[model samples]
Target: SMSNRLIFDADWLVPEQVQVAGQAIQYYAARNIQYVQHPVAAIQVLNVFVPAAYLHGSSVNGYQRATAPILMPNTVGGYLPGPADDPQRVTWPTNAGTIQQALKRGYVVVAAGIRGRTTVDKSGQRVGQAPAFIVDMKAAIRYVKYNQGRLPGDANRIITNGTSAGGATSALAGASGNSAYFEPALTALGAAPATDDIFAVSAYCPIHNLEHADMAYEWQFNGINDWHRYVSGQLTVEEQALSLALKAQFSTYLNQLKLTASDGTHLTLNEAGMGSFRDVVRQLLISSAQTAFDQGTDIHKYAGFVVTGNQVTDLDLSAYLKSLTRMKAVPAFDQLDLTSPENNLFGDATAKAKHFTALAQTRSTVTAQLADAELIQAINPLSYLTTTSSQVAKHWRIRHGAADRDTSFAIPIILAIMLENHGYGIDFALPWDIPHSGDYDLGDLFSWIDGLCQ
Candidate 1:
């Protein structure tokens, strides 16, 4: 019986401690706690680490056990299964100090595991696939809300965080919260019937907007097809044509959204993917360079930066993008060979992978079958973020590293602009020199969380 009684067990605590900044941070740890009544995979579980202040009902950094914010960080990477953490067993590192920092800041920390594309049941059926990973995450959210006061934190103040593909999951979990789109999946998993909506969300280099990501990626590097590391040969003539097609489509898609920046600039793209949108991105890069200079990094060496006495006055966006070198080949996400991780993310229980884009489907040398259209839309945060009906996290802290080539800067930038367009409290930025990683910006990240919770 993996918990027919799905309620959280407050007494299920194991003493765990860590040292941060010459001080001990202690917590009551709960590990391998199943969130769903029936978890399809063993990895579909979560861990909760309550600050020791909860036992005394005391306050830490102006937060009491009942009022403290619950921080949920998922460990998903490359759409693979993320198993629950056991704080009692593993040693903590100071650099990747996420859990310790949250507890030290007087917030309840929960790590929720989720099913991934590779998960299979005892019967050998593919159990964890498209929509399942996020569904498992939402179940954990409902589990937190259902426990309410019985648990050690404010259910209403629940915040989620992740990096890369996991970051996309965080974006998805935040945007699609409490939407009835996931009802059947939740009901099937025997998850508690409660609000799954989150209070805040944080993602670093969140590779989202999958339906449009390839076009966006192509839009950014249309003329370049060099896979910097390993490539058998140059892009074929046909692949170059495919890249051009995806790039042009991006402009058509972006212009329709009609997004606006804080400065009242209409973000649009011409047929060649050049216009105000590129201008906005250029400005963001300059800001990042300015921040880097401020942080003691010498900016004179970089080719595009036009520096003036520690201030980044201008930038050559083309030079900077080319310097990043190509991380993926043409048609990055939905590949013609059905090889991309995203292709697997869109996989169903039966098919290990399937195409989700019209462009890729047409050129796919692999299977011609496409993924479930509704599910594809269901997994994208942009799909729900634009619609006012869906209850999204009111507070957002979105960051994409400046040097991250995993996805285009266009992805996170568009995400930020849309949230701003909807009037949500946002603190979006592209940290300079950082690439394709999360938890590195925790100092900046947690303070924002602390300020919001205050």
Candidate 2:
């Protein structure tokens, strides 16, 4: 038997519960609370799971007793309110299997549905703002700690787990436990602060900065002239051409690269070939080479043009070639002036090409901003695990599949290798041929959790 919408209070999505292996389980959800000031509205569902297995005690060595209930978020996994309006129409095969495994292991898992799914904004409508999810999580945690008979979750030993986005949320919950650092959490709920601390956090591929990324959000803006057409994917041929022009301009931002500045002096590729620029060039070559080969084009034809004499030592190539690939351009909306009616009218390849050229000149500025937003303030648990306050025990096991291009498993591999090579207490398991499926190794995950929880 399962129950949903258990505690409906007008706007809140009802909690859903299902019995698994003789254990009565429940998951909580709430409606979005709008925050007019922010770009995204503040409505999200908070889910809480109770596993009957944890109610009993086991005599295991070094097993820390449950001090509080664990709260985890869906890192990069986008949130959904529920199975559409009809539960019968929904199909989540993997989740069901995972739940079955959890029931067998006696560990209940709680998850929250983030507002606006994943992105900060969708359809010109800001969705899933950060403060909203954080506030809801904190409130749910508080609710669990206080509601002893209803929810016996331990507040003191609350642990948070998320692969990417959820992982980041967990980290934020723990790191920003002190109110001064996270004023938004307090204001969103319009409620008093609590003393509960997030005990442990398991984050994977977390998004630290909600603003910028290796990818930018503005790319969506440049794809169409009229915002409605762009949002709806309804464009006239002329409009489509115009949108394409803008997209091309965005894709190939030559102005940002600035081979030749307004002063008429061209910046040498060698000079620009420092640090991440070099890697960028390498990546471009690899991606372009693969794309060309995939499209039945000879890499040798472009190899001569792309592989300059300074290819070994330098990064930058001709601006024309870079424009062809649109390698360095961030999202178009980020840099474009959308106020002018002319700005709204896209197309005209010449104008698009010129826009790309201008982007090349200002590329450094955008890169700097990206670094500031994504790198400096990264909320990643992997990076923070080394800190003394993290309470992450040694012998931590981290695992990811090889085929996980979505999560960029390479990032974790690099981090883990760097940390472990330096004699840190981290062990990573990367199954080379594994797909992006989170269902890769449930037993392993559960075993690790069981060992760690104990």
Candidate 3:
């Protein structure tokens, strides 16, 4: 049986301090500790950071609770290997990383090192693939929950956060809680026999919905035929034809989703791609532009937007697409040649990458194989939202940058809308002019956390 007890070594954690939000806060740093056991791999380790109960004769940040909410942040990017974060030397361009920010807010932080698509054993056998990363994350959650009283935080209030691929896994962890699909994998890995459900999830520019991402990319960028201008290499005429074909496929998928806006209007795309769904996207841009204008940005720099004294009157959707062109060529996520990172993500020990979509498989230059449908559904969080067995997170905070072309803006917005439809509390938005990154606004994030956990 797996050990549910945590044996704390006094020398494991050391005293450390870091500056956050222009204030210095002291914390205790707990280094790498394995969350799961394996025969040969060391990729399942995690680290925890606790705020010092007392600093200079007062509680740290006026916090005196022995059971604080835990912030579990993953550093996975491009579906690559994610290592545990060091609490003492955490840094970010905009502010301190989430680990430091949570510590400053008197929240215990747990950063996990998850195995990803690139992990391989010494025998040249692939170890981490589709569902492996998410499985490892769920195992880490079970580990924390299993050691409830022994750990420094409340296991029931765990919040998972990440960016891009990490964000996708975080959403999966929140959406696929207590799912039986991952049980056999967890059991084989010797994970703690406890619940893996998380209380909340925070995703930033999550690049998910792999099977449909290509069509979504086409729907947003099919009009821009100059692939050489934005993409890394030149596109062939055949590839451009494929782009239009994929663009047309998105309308069907959007209709299948049966999503609705906040006003109860059904969101559906048309043949010309101008419909209530497109209107919803346009409104999101206008909202972000309004936020930017209110924050003292020069709105006049953007040419086709109709702006009066203080309100954004209208925005030309066509012109906006021209300004922010597509970043990838046709079939962006599941390439015809099967070179995308997502293809690598779905591959197994014998293969490096495989087609996750039937369209890509039919047009592949090399002999193509389709990924397992069950595995495809396993990685997607949307598949579990409608199921009664899944324990969905009660709170969600999703943000995708308006300027981010890495994935379509519709991805996270659709996810938030679906979650809201299921009666969950969602704080979703497109931050003004931000790019494909996370942990930018720690102050606002922690404020939301405090409101819920405190």
Write out the backbone clash pairs for model 3.
none
lDDT of each: 0.84, 0.38, 0.81
Q: Which is better, 1 or 3, measured by lDDT?
A: 1
After superposing candidate 1, which stretches have Cα over 4 Å from the reference? 1-3, 86-96, 229-233
Please, what is the TM-score per model? Answer: 0.95, 0.48, 0.93
Lowest summed lDDT over 10 consecutive residues: which window, candidate 2?
Answer: 80-89
Error of 1 at 210 (Å): 0.6
Poorest stretch of ten by lDDT in candidate 3: 87-96
Backbone clash count, each prediction separately: 0, 42, 0
What's the true lDDT of residue 211 in model 3?
89
Q: For residues 1-454, what per-residue lDDT tens digits would candidate 2 score against the true structure?
A: 0122223132233555565566555433332322122223333334444443334443122231253234343423432222111111135411454544443455444544444232334444433333444554555444444443344344555555555444445555655454343455544444323443555544444434322222221222333233221122343454444344433432333224333322454322232222332344344345444444455654453222354432323323333232222211232222332221112111121221111223322442332111122222333334343444433323334544422333332244434543443344554554433434454566665565555555
- Tens-place lDDT per residue, model 3, 1-454, is 2453334443566788877668887777777677765522576788878787722324444454455888898888889878777655443311136677778787878888888898987786889888889988998898888877666777998999999999898898989999899998988887876899999899989888888899888888887765533235665798789988998899988888889887787889888677998888888889989999999997656555789888998998778776776678778899888788898998999888999998999899887789999999989988887743438888889889888888888788789888887777789889888877988877778888888876
Give the total clashing residue pairs for model 3: 0
User: Candidate 1's residue-wise lDDT over 85-186, tens digit each?
Assistant: 544435321122777878888888888878888889878888878888799989999999989968899999998988887889899988997888889989
The order of the candidates by TM-score, greatest first, is 1, 3, 2
